[PDB]
Amino acid sequence: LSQVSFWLNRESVPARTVFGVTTVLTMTTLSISARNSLPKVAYATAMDWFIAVCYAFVFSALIEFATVNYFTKSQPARAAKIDRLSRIAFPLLFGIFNLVYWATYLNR
Amino acid sequence: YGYTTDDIEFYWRGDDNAVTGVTKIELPQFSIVDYKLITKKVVFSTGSYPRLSLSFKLKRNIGYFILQTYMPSILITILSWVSFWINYDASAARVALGITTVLT
């Protein structure tokens, strides 16, 4: 959902901001609940790592929107290029992370 | 309970090695730092009684709290700062950022 916002029009600043804000806050809520699921161990679990990486991806999507907005009406070709490149660099990277993660942990 | 120091005396057998297994205790949220054995007498209206005291020092582990409360708060504050890069003419976006972070 946080990567869906790359396909919205950059003239729609409030919409993509709603996207980023709502997704990062949802990630915060999910992390809090999942860390409330299990006992109070002082170390990180595999689910904690998965959640931290997903939060990083969502926050990076919001930061990409901020960069695109910072480069709109000042250098529009650059913001268009950034959106176009992100549209393929985020989902591929998340697929690669999911592959590596599940391969590492489902073998143990 | 019933016998005073005229009837009964308490002492630790070994006097420092009387308590074993403290280093072999694994608490999930705490670490035992020190334990102490004490031998004293207490006084109530009914007389003076022997007492032994076994005390443990417990230092809390903060990793769980780094993962539970501190890091979400730091992340929400940084999310709040994200608004400083949006242009100031955009009112709905900056208001959404600010209101969401404040209320969260």
Ligand SMILES: *[C@@H]1O[C@H](CO)[C@@H](O[C@@H]2O[C@H](CO)[C@@H](O[C@@H]3O[C@H](CO)[C@@H](O)[C@H](O)[C@@H]3O)[C@H](O)[C@H]2NC(C)=O)[C@H](O)[C@H]1NC(C)=O
């Ligand atoms: C945890 O709390 C207890 C309770 O305060 C601490 O025990 C206290 O330990 C000190 C030093 O070991 C005792 O003081 C000593 O009293 C004797 C009495 O003869 C005196 O000769 C010494 O010079 C010294 O002043 C103190 O009495 C004792 N508290 C009680 C209520 O008996 C303990 O140290 C704390 N920490 C740990 C790790 O247990």
